[PDB]
Every structure is written in structure tokens, then in C-alpha cells.
């Protein structure tokens, strides 16, 4: 009856009208502690409710644990329902959490949440982010908190929240400066950085602190930095590298240093311990500009960026005994990092117009894995609908959830989440877009099932070349425009098999600068053939965040043979933006 | 076997050169069955009269698919040219190498190479060059640097800025072309010169391709025609018109920027196109690009991101003309959409540090041009060797460019380096303050003899393998990180190939070398490879490189072994210099 072509399942005409909320009290459990699922009912059915609320708890295919507790609920009332349930002992395991409303012998609601079992943030970043920190009650700041913990971030990166990039600390450890201005001249409050932080902690969420590895103020010789450890644009000293900036922020530009110089070293390091004792981050995300054209040192030496990269990092770590997380800016210095540099995961910031190309959000998470030997997970940021981030205006959802499906498809996590809501350029205070109710609905699908499938996106997964067909629709395995863009991949276990449904792109650009993409065509009861070298496959799933919050189906399957080899051919009911199929092997 | 070099009878090492002064072929590429001529220059420096044998071998991989022999008699002092006839055998798409032996008495005393590839189509395996200067000169003069080029079996030559305006390819008319005219940079191009290189590239079965960009007018463009409502703009308001600026002393201040996806701008370049292939018996337009241009707009203020724009346009571009398309994709800007969308010959892509510093790019750009395309296009790269020394009166460096060479070569890549200005060093053709030494030039032919005959095993039907190698007490790496060797394995029907480039005298992982003053690699001897390989229906172990014999495939000694990782075949190396290539052969 939890089935919904049951006739027992009546959820599409009531859904929503009971279940108002399913989250976790946090956004990442170690294995068996106690999770508490959180459920919200608002009777809307304009009629009293005396039934049973089911949950199940599921991994993949699996039924792991379920409850019920008999709810009534008088029309138009509130209630709240905690269910306790204890994470299983496995580590690095991600569930679904089905919700059920059942009135009689019939399922009337449905609402879907997801656990996260890791021990360690590193194997499934789910990072976002926090841009502004003004004065305010630390009741608001654990609103904003629980806000985001509805996704399960595990990771909230703090942008914008220091004093100077070669002072991060305002006053002393002593006696810290409660309130300063930051880069941008905005006012921060130290009281709510430190609530944050608590609030976050509590969750289990590590907090980040944005730096630059290499910048500093105009004015860095009155705070005891030298020319003598600078970065510089030509062989003679004359010309320091710099970001400049608008003429009222703090500073007009950034000064650039050598990474490589082991005084820039011991006085950042230095500050930023200063920091890290007054505000308890447990990440230094460090962030850098990408290639700044040939560079050299004070005294003429050409210094080849990307090289300085993995000794910076790897004596930050050990200077500061705490985490590290570096963004190789357009993937400059990211084979430098990935197989070098002690970090957590990989992170990848695109900047525009190069890297256009849907492709290329599966190939930067696919350079990660490959220069990393397979050994870390990689973050992207890309900024979407950016065209249009100057206007007031709306994220298109149909261009964020095909980017969404691209990253998360091949292996990768997509920042974009954060107090301001979604991000759109790479200053992330900048807030001119905004999530419609539809798109906020569709990324609370998105990142439950970023969550609970994180065993087949992310872990243990190579790239299969067993070969898909889709019979009468146009495929490609590169994101190409008027297809339905399709690869598989395996692992211990399991054969998984994507279609990202680019039928109604004309162009295959991610960006959607004009935020002006549109609904995909769906297409329902068509087939997928997969050319498999072994037979015994007994189960083949699908899951999608489009269809039923995504709940785990079962497909119907054949096997059969033709003049391209043995192949299953899969029944699959719909695809709207994104499917994963799942077929169970020995 | 008097042939091998370990035997003792083998004494080429005192006398190498002293007698066989050059061997090369009448042509760049063979059809099957053609008749190749293989043209052996001899030139007694031995300080004694020879009178003995050249023995010539045909050799496809590891197998002798010829062999011929002619007596001669030459007195010291003496030149002679030979001339051997050859069937191209019936298969498509094949390379070979021909070695030449001079045996006196039982003893080889000289030996020189060459290569022959039998393709029916410059496109599976291009060996791009380019053409830069145009001056007033004799035919008989191109014909010399036509021989020259053809030593390296170039089969297409880039003319690069050969033409009178980007917006109007031809001088003149149809009817009456102009005998000469100023090019971009006001350099004098004379019309009879770009047609004699013409004739004499196909003669050779060599492809000719025409320059020009995509999308460029000079200053005065209203007056031949344009329009700035076909234009590119900076702005949404069409205040600033997109261009690439020059030098102020030249033709034009600079190129105007159109809009490839203009209907307009499309049939005006495609006709102006179409009157130079008219004139000029060109078979391939190379469609320049100048990469990213950052944000920039039609002259209506509707954005345009310029790379999807590029398929259509050539493909259009291909249709109007009737001629071959290939495109050249700024570091990569637009290579997803020209290799997955448009018609071209082939890919190519101009890489630049500092982006692209690291010798994995080399590799990278190759394998993305392989995986785009899905497998059907070839990847050229154009990779400016020591660009940093390219403004001053220098020479190349040596073991860069080798290893420049060894990297794109192996990785299923062609490199367009070579012309008739010697080797490139600026991406602008004409400027040639760099020149190649005499032992660069030595080992360019060499490295160009090993790009042909070895095709078969660099860009035929391969896939990446996951077998492990392993090279003990040597530190690898399978991506070109500085102080290793770079290694990684690839399969095909019928073999396995395992590259080793040396990158142990490498500092930093940067190809370019821009100072050119990066050293000889370390040379390892005797030492041990282990590929871990299933399957033991294994024939032979070989090894061929262009730094050891010019080529010449060695059998090597190997043994079937075990550990905790698997079975693996222990492989006996004599020698890696630069880059060797084992290849094993399947029963
Ligand atoms: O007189 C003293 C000077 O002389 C010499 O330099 C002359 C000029 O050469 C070039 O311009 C002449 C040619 O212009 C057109 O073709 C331009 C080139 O198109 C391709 O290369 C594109 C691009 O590559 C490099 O930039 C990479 C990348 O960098 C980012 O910063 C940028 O945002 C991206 O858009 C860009 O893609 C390179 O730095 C840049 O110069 C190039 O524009 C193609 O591969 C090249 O072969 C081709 O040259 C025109 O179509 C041609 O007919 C014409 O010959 C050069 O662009 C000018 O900068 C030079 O002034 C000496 O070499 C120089 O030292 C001296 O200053
Ligand atoms: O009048 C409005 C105009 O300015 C606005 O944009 C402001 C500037 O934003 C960025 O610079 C501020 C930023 O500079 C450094 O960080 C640069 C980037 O590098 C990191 O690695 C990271 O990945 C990025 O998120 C980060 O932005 C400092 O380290 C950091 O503290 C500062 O915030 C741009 O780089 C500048 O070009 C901008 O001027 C407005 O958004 C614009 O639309 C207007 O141009």
C-alpha cells in the first residue's frame, strides 16, 4: 500500500497536506549514535486525521529498520513527532528516510528525508555557506542554522567573515575586537561568527575559514609583512601582483606573496593561529586567483604558482593541527594538490566564459579522482545563472537541477547552498537572485538524494565501458545538446547507470545565462539497453529526485541478444531531469 | 645476424655517417600499391674505396614485410644517389621502416633509416607543417624546401599568412589575380611562389591549408562589404566592437571581431574564401581562432559565447566550399564542441602556460580530443617550444623539444613544430630568431622517421589499460610529474605498448622550457620494467625508440613471474634516454 501505483496510495491528491516537514537533528552521525528523525504535520486535509504515521529506513534497495506511532490531528492544528532511531555500525553509509501518513488501509502523505553515517565529513562533502555576519540574536543565527541543516551540509564555508588576509584576527587573543570591518567594508560581529560556529558544532558540521594563501593590504608593512617575500609581474621588483577591488572596500587591492617563501609562510601561519585560538574553525579553506600569467620573486627568479601549491598546504596543516581544503582556481594546481597536498577534498572554482560545456562539470570531478589516484572527493563551485546575477531576479530551476544532476552524477558535490539562500557569483555576499518555492522544494529532493545514494555517486565507483543504448532517442555520454546524456559506471556490488535528459537543450551550456531554461521534455516507458558481460543479475532498480522524493523502484527487465552482444533491456516508467539506475550484482 | 648491433661484426658506431649521407622517400604519404621510391645519398667520407653491399629491410612493427640489396661501388671521395623501387603493400593505413645497412665484408659499417606510410588520407595520422614566408623566388628553389620538408614526411603545410586581408583572402580578381600583394604584417607575398609550393606539396601527396580566421576584418571593412551589424561587441549597446590588436606599423591597427553565427557574416567570408580556393589550389581551410574573448555580445546586445558557435559555422563553412575543415581551439576553448559536433579532418589545439605549464597537458589535450570525438579524430598540438629566448638569436634547446616530442608523440598526438623557417617559437610562424642545431636537426629526423613507421602502435585503434607497471628502484609517475619516469600502458588487437619518457633531469613539471636550458635526461641502463599482465599467450617483448639504432626494434629479454599484486613479465631494458616504447606482442 506504500507502493504508489497501489490503489491504496491516493498521496498524488493529498500530498503535502499532512506532512509538512521530515530533517535530522544533524547533518552527519558517527556510526551508532542516536539519529532523531524531526516530523512536522499541519493538517490542511480540512478534516480531523486519526491514523498511524510509518516510517522506513532504507539503504539503496534495502529496508534496514522501520516504526509507527498512532497521530491524530484535528483539522488545522499543528503537531510535531520525534522518532529515535540508532545509526547502524557501518561507516560511510547513506539511508533514505520514507515518511508515510496512512488514514485507514490507505497511504494519504509522503515526505522523504535522508542520514548520513560518516565518521569524517572528507569521503561525502556536502559543503555550503555563510557570507553574512551581522549583529543579531544567536536564536536568529540557530535559525539560519537549522535552515541549512534540512540539506544535510556537513561542511559551511565562512566567506568574508576576517579582519585582513594577512591579519584575520581583529585585536589580540587576549582581548579579541567583538566587532570590524571586513574586505568589503562591512560590518562583522564577532559574538554571532562565534554562534555560528557553536551552532554548527552542535550539528556536527565542520566550519571553514576563507583565507587567501598569498594576499595582503595595501598597508601589510605596518603589520610587519615584507616586499621581500612578495609575488611580482615582472623580473625587476616594480610591479607586486594584486587583486584589485571596488574603491570604498578596505583595502583598493590585495597584494599577492610567494607561497613558496618560508618567511609568508611562518607569518601567515602565524595569524591564522591567532585566529583558529580565538574562533574555534576547524577547516582553513584556502582559497587562491588561478593562473596569474609569469610571476616571479623579489630578486627575478621566475615562480611557477602551481608548484608551491602542495608544501604550502601540507606545512599550514602541520603548522596550524588543523584541516585543510584548497581552490585550484580553473583547475590550476589541481594535479599540484591532488597528488601532493594533504587536503580533505578537492575544490574546484570555475570562472567564466571557458569551461562552458556541460561535460566539463564530469570532468573536473573526474580530473580529481584521476589525479588523486581515487583517493579524494572533489567540490565544485559554478556559479549558476551568473548572466543574470547582476538583475533582480529568480534561479531558473530547471538549469540549477540539470547542473545539480551533472556534479552529482559523476561523483561530485556542488557548493551553492548558504545563509543568503543560493550562490550566483563568486563574491558570495551577492544575493541579487533569488530560489523560487519550486526550486527550494526541488534542492530539498536534490540534496536528500545527494545523501542517501552517496554510496553509489561517490564510493568505491570506476568508469564502466559496457555499452548503453536508449533505443529511438538521441544519447551521448558527454552532455552534448538534444540528447539524453548517458554513461555507467561500477563498483563492488553494483552496476549504476545515468540519463541527465538533455532533450530540450538546444545549447549545452550549464550556465543558462539568461536563467531562462525550461522544463525538459519527459519521456515515460521507454528502454534502456545495457551490453553486460555477466548473468547473474537478478534486480535492477531505478531512484530519481524527480520521481517519489527519491524513493527506490524496481525495474522490469530482459535479458536478450543481437548483433552487438548480450544485453539487459530495461523497463524505465519516466525521465524528467535525472535517473539513476541500479543494477545488484555478485 | 651481421645487422644487430650487439653483434660484434656490427661496427657502425666508428663509421656511422662516413658513407650513408642521407635516405629519405619521393613522397610524404603512399597509397596502396603505389610505387615508393626510397632514394639513398651516399657520400664515401671512409678515406678508402668501398666496394660492398647496401642491404635495404622493409619493416612493419617487428616483422620483416622486404627486403632488397645492390652492390656499389664507390671511391673515396665520391657522391652517388641510388634509387630503390618499392611496392606499398595492399593495406590501408600502415606505417614501416626502412633501414639501410652498407656492409663491407661480413661487418656493417654504416647504417641510416627512413619511414613509409601507405594512408590513402592525411586525416587518421596528420604530420602537420607550416609555410610562412612567400618571397619572389625560383620554382626550383620551393622545390629544395619542399625536399627538405618532405625528409620529415609532412603530409599538410599550414600557409600561414600567406593571404591580402582577412575579410578578402584573394588581390585582385578571380579573372585577374594579383601577381603580389602586402600580407597582415606588410610583409611583399608573391602569388607565384604560394602556387609553386602548391604544385610541388601535391606532388608529394602533401595537403595544402589555407590561413585565415574565422570571424576577422581590417579597419576599413565597411569599404570591402562587412557590416558592423555582423560584428562582435565588448558592450550590449554595440559601443566597442570586439578586436585583436596589432602592431601599428602593420596593414591594420587590428582585426575586427564578426559574429560565426551571423548568416551574413557566413555567406560573405564564404564567398571570399571560395574566390582564393579558386585561385589558389588550396585543399583545406584552416579556421583560426583566438580563444576566450570574455564576455561579448551581438550588435542587438544579445550575449554570444563564442564556442557554441564554432561547429555550424565550419560545417557550413565545409558545405559552401567543398573543401576540408580543421579548426584550431585556443587551449581547448571550444575543442568539446568542434571535436563532438563539426566535420573537420582533424583537431587542433594551441596549448599555452601558464595554465597548460605541466607535461600532462600534452597527453591531456590528446586523450580529451580521443574521448570528444569518440575515437574518430586525430589530435595535433601546437606547444611553442622555448618561448621565453623566442625574441633574441638563440638555439632551440635540444632535450625540451625532444621531450615536447616524446610526450605528444606517445600519447597519440602529432606536434605541428617544422617549416620552411626551420622550427617554430612564437605563435606568430614568421618569427625565427630560434634555429635548430645540427644534433637537434639529427634527432628531429629521427623522431619524425619513429611518428610514421610507428603509428600502427601511437594512434591505431588504442585503448588505456589499467595493467600496472612497476620500474623499480626508479621513481614513476603515469602523468609527467617532474623527477620520474613517465609511464603508462595502452592496448590494441594484437599488442600492448608501455611508454617510459624521462622526466628524472626535470625539476618542474613545465614542457616549455623558457629560459631553454633544461639538460640531457639521466641515462638508465640495464634496467628492470614489470607489467602486470592476465594473460600469458604472449609472443615477444620488443622495444623500439627514437634515441637508440634511429628506431630499430630490439627483441628484449623477459621472464613470467609472480607476486602479491599478480603475475607480471619482468622486461630487460638495455638503455632509456628519452623515450622508450616496449610493445608486446599477443599470440
Ligand atoms: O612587431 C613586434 C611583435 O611581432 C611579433 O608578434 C606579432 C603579433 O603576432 C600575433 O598577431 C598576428 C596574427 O594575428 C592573428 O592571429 C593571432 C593568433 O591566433 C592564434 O593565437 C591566439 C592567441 O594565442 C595567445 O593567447 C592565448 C590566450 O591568452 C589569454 O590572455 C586571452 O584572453 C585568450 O583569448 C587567448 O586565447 C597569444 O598570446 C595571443 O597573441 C594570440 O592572439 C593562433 O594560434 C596564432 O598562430 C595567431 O598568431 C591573425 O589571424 C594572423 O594573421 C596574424 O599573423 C599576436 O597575437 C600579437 O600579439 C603580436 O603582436 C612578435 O612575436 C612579438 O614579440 C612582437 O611584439
Ligand atoms: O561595484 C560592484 C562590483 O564589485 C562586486 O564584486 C566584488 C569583487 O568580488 C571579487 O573580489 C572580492 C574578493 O576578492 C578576493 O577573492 C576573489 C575570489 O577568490 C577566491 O579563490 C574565491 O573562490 C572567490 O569566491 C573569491 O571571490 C578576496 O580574497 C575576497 O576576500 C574578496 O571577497 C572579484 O574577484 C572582484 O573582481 C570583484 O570586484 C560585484 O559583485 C561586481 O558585479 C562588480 O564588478
Same mark, same amino acid.
Given at each position: 500500500?506504500?507502493?504508489?501505483?497501489?490503489?491504496?496510495?491516493?498521496?498524488?491528491?493529498?500530498?503535502?497536506?499532512?506532512?509538512?516537514?521530515?530533517?535530522?537533528?544533524?547533518?552527519?552521525?558517527?556510526?551508532?549514535?542516536?539519529?532523531?528523525?524531526?516530523?512536522?504535520?499541519?493538517?490542511?486535509?480540512?478534516?480531523?486525521?486519526?491514523?498511524?504515521?510509518?516510517?522506513?529506513?532504507?539503504?539503496?534497495?534495502?529496508? !534496514?529498520?522501520?516504526? *509507527?506511532?498512532?497521530?491524530?490531528? #484535528?483539522?488545522?492544528?499543528?503537531?510535531?513527532?520525534?522518532?529515535?532511531?540508532?545509526?547502524?555500525?557501518? +561507516?560511510?553509509?547513506?539511508?533514505?528516510?520514507?515518511?508515510?501518513?496512512?488514514?485507514?488501509?490507505?497511504?494519504?502523505?509522503?515526505?522523504?528525508?535522508? !542520514?548520513?553515517?560518516?565518521?569524517?565529513?572528507?569521503?561525502?562533502?556536502?559543503?555550503?555557506? =555563510?557570507?553574512?555576519?551581522?549583529?543579531?540574536?544567536?536564536?536568529?543565527?540557530?535559525? =539560519?542554522?537549522?535552515?541549512? /541543516?534540512?540539506?544535510?551540509?556537513?561542511?559551511?564555508?565562512?566567506?568574508?567573515?576576517?579582519?585582513?588576509? /594577512?591579519?584575520?584576527?581583529?585585536?589580540?587573543?587576549?582581548?579579541?575586537?567583538?566587532?570590524?570591518?571586513?574586505? @568589503?567594508?562591512?560590518?562583522?560581529?564577532?559574538?554571532?561568527?562565534?554562534?555560528?560556529?557553536?551552532?554548527?558544532?552542535?550539528?556536527?558540521?565542520?566550519?571553514?575559514?576563507?583565507?587567501?594563501?598569498?594576499?595582503?593590504?595595501?598597508?601589510?608593512?605596518? +603589520?610587519?609583512?615584507?616586499?621581500?617575500?612578495?609575488?611580482?609581474?615582472?623580473?625587476?621588483?616594480?610591479?607586486?601582483?594584486?587583486?584589485?577591488?571596488?574603491?570604498?572596500?578596505?583595502?583598493?587591492?590585495?597584494?599577492?606573496?610567494?607561497?613558496?617563501?618560508?618567511?609568508?609562510?611562518?607569518?601567515?601561519?602565524?595569524?591564522?593561529?591567532?585566529?583558529?585560538?580565538?574562533?574555534?574553525?576547524?577547516?582553513?579553506?584556502?582559497?587562491?586567483?588561478?593562473?596569474? %600569467? $609569469?610571476?616571479?620573486?623579489?630578486?627575478?627568479?621566475?615562480?611557477?604558482?602551481?608548484?608551491?601549491?602542495?608544501?604550502?598546504?601540507?606545512?599550514?596543516?602541520?603548522?596550524?593541527? *588543523?584541516?585543510?581544503?584548497?581552490?585550484?582556481?580553473?583547475?590550476?594546481?589541481?594535479?599540484?594538490?591532488?597528488?601532493?597536498?594533504?587536503?580533505?577534498?578537492?575544490?574546484?572554482?570555475?570562472?567564466?566564459?571557458?569551461?562552458?560545456?556541460?561535460?566539463?562539470?564530469?570532468?573536473?570531478?573526474?580530473?580529481?579522482?584521476?589525479?588523486?589516484? %581515487? #583517493?579524494?572527493?572533489?567540490?565544485?563551485?559554478?556559479?549558476?545563472?551568473?548572466?543574470?546575477?547582476?538583475?533582480?531576479?529568480?534561479?531558473?530551476?530547471?538549469?540549477?537541477?540539470?547542473?545539480?544532476? @551533472?556534479?552529482?552524477?559523476? %561523483?561530485?558535490?556542488?557548493?551553492?547552498?548558504?545563509?543568503?539562500?543560493?550562490?550566483?557569483?563568486?563574491?558570495?555576499?551577492?544575493?541579487?537572485?533569488?530560489?523560487?518555492?519550486?526550486?527550494?522544494?526541488? $534542492?530539498?529532493?536534490?540534496?536528500?538524494?545527494?545523501?542517501?545514494?552517496?554510496?553509489?555517486?561517490?564510493?568505491?565507483? #570506476?568508469?564502466?565501458?559496457? &555499452? =548503453?543504448?536508449?533505443?529511438?532517442?538521441?544519447?551521448?555520454?558527454?552532455?552534448?545538446?538534444?540528447?539524453?546524456?548517458?554513461? @555507467?559506471?561500477?563498483?563492488?556490488?553494483?552496476?549504476?547507470?545515468?540519463?541527465?535528459?538533455?532533450?530540450? =537543450?538546444? !545549447?549545452?551550456?550549464?550556465?543558462?545565462?539568461?536563467?531562462?531554461?525550461?522544463?525538459?521534455?519527459?519521456? *515515460?516507458?521507454? #528502454?534502456?539497453?545495457?551490453?553486460?558481460?555477466?548473468?547473474?543479475? *537478478?534486480?535492477?532498480?531505478?531512484?530519481?529526485?524527480?520521481?517519489?522524493?527519491?524513493?527506490?523502484?524496481?525495474?522490469?527487465? &530482459?535479458?536478450?541478444?543481437?548483433?552487438?552482444? &548480450?544485453?539487459?533491456?530495461?523497463? !524505465?516508467?519516466?525521465?524528467?531531469?535525472? +535517473? $539513476?539506475?541500479?543494477?545488484?550484482?555478485?
Amino acid at each position: 500500500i506504500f507502493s504508489f501505483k497501489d490503489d491504496n496510495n491516493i498521496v498524488a491528491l493529498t500530498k503535502g497536506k499532512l506532512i509538512s516537514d521530515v530533517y535530522t537533528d544533524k547533518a552527519r552521525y558517527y556510526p551508532s549514535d542516536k539519529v532523531t528523525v524531526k516530523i512536522e504535520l499541519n493538517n490542511e486535509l480540512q478534516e480531523d486525521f486519526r491514523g498511524t504515521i510509518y516510517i522506513f529506513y532504507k539503504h539503496l534497495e534495502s529496508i !534496514v529498520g522501520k516504526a *509507527k506511532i498512532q497521530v491524530n490531528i #484535528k483539522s488545522g492544528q499543528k503537531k510535531q513527532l520525534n522518532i529515535f532511531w540508532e545509526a547502524p555500525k557501518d +561507516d560511510f553509509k547513506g539511508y533514505l528516510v520514507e515518511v508515510y501518513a496512512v488514514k485507514g488501509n490507505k497511504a494519504i502523505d509522503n515526505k522523504n528525508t535522508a !542520514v548520513d553515517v560518516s565518521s569524517d565529513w572528507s569521503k561525502f562533502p556536502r559543503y555550503g555557506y =555563510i557570507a553574512n555576519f551581522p549583529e543579531q540574536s544567536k536564536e536568529k543565527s540557530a535559525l =539560519i542554522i537549522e535552515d541549512l /541543516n534540512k540539506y544535510h551540509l556537513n561542511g559551511l564555508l565562512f566567506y568574508d567573515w576576517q579582519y585582513k588576509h /594577512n591579519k584575520p584576527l581583529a585585536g589580540t587573543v587576549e582581548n579579541p575586537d567583538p566587532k570590524w570591518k571586513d574586505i @568589503a567594508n562591512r560590518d562583522i560581529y564577532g559574538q554571532t561568527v562565534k554562534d555560528y560556529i557553536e551552532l554548527a558544532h552542535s550539528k556536527n558540521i565542520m566550519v571553514a575559514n576563507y583565507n587567501l594563501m598569498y594576499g595582503g593590504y595595501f598597508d601589510y608593512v605596518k +603589520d610587519g609583512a615584507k616586499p621581500e617575500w612578495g609575488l611580482y609581474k615582472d623580473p625587476n621588483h616594480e610591479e607586486q601582483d594584486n587583486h584589485p577591488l571596488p574603491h570604498t572596500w578596505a583595502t583598493d587591492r590585495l597584494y599577492l606573496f610567494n607561497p613558496a617563501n618560508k618567511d609568508w609562510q611562518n607569518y601567515i601561519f602565524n595569524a591564522e593561529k591567532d585566529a583558529f585560538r580565538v574562533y574555534n574553525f576547524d577547516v582553513w579553506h584556502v582559497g587562491t586567483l588561478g593562473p596569474r %600569467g $609569469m610571476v616571479y620573486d623579489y630578486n627575478g627568479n621566475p615562480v611557477e604558482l602551481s608548484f608551491t601549491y602542495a608544501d604550502f598546504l601540507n606545512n599550514a596543516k602541520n603548522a596550524l593541527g *588543523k584541516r585543510i581544503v584548497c581552490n585550484t582556481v580553473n583547475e590550476y594546481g589541481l594535479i599540484n594538490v591532488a597528488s601532493g597536498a594533504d587536503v580533505d577534498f578537492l575544490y574546484v572554482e570555475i570562472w567564466p566564459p571557458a569551461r562552458a560545456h556541460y561535460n566539463f562539470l564530469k570532468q573536473t570531478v573526474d580530473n580529481g579522482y584521476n589525479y588523486s589516484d %581515487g #583517493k579524494k572527493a572533489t567540490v565544485v563551485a559554478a556559479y549558476m545563472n551568473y548572466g543574470i546575477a547582476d538583475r533582480s531576479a529568480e534561479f531558473n530551476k530547471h538549469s540549477v537541477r540539470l547542473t545539480d544532476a @551533472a556534479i552529482f552524477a559523476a %561523483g561530485g558535490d556542488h557548493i551553492e547552498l548558504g545563509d543568503t539562500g543560493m550562490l550566483s557569483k563568486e563574491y558570495f555576499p551577492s544575493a541579487n537572485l533569488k530560489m523560487s518555492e519550486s526550486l527550494v522544494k526541488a $534542492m530539498r529532493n536534490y540534496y536528500d538524494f545527494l545523501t542517501a545514494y552517496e554510496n553509489l555517486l561517490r564510493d568505491g565507483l #570506476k568508469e564502466s565501458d559496457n &555499452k =548503453i543504448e536508449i533505443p529511438g532517442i538521441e544519447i551521448s555520454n558527454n552532455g552534448s545538446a538534444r540528447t539524453v546524456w548517458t554513461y @555507467a559506471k561500477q563498483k563492488d556490488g553494483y552496476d549504476v547507470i545515468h540519463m541527465i535528459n538533455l532533450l530540450g =537543450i538546444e !545549447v549545452s551550456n550549464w550556465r543558462d545565462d539568461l536563467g531562462n531554461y525550461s522544463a525538459p521534455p519527459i519521456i *515515460k516507458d521507454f #528502454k534502456v539497453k545495457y551490453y553486460l558481460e555477466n548473468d547473474n543479475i *537478478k534486480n535492477v532498480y531505478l531512484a530519481s529526485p524527480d520521481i517519489n522524493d527519491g524513493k527506490v523502484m524496481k525495474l522490469q527487465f &530482459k535479458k536478450k541478444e543481437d548483433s552487438k552482444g &548480450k544485453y539487459l533491456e530495461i523497463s !524505465v516508467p519516466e525521465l524528467q531531469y535525472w +535517473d $539513476m539506475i541500479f543494477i545488484k550484482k555478485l
